[PDB]
Design a protein around this ligand. Sequence first.
Ligand SMILES: [Cu+2]
Length: 99
Amino acid sequence: VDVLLGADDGSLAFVPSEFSVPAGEKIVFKNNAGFPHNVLFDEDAVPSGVDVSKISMSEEDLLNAKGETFEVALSDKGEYTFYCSPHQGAGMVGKVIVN
Ligand SMILES: [Cu+2]
């Protein structure tokens, strides 16, 4: 499934902000507008047994150009919160439900 980083109108949103995916489907975060963005998972809001380090960009690593991607596949079922490091305080956070 593709998730845009930044709305076309410059909003600091993942698009979609919430969605479900079957376990193991590739999620393609696609840099879109209103850079820089990156994608990390919140160690306090993922299913028990998930290691966010394996599924998160390094916080120091930013996507500054349209069409860069960050790709991840989530095998454990449950709710995960992801966020953009530079924009976390501006509400650029999302939820994926893996089913
Ligand atoms: Cu961002």
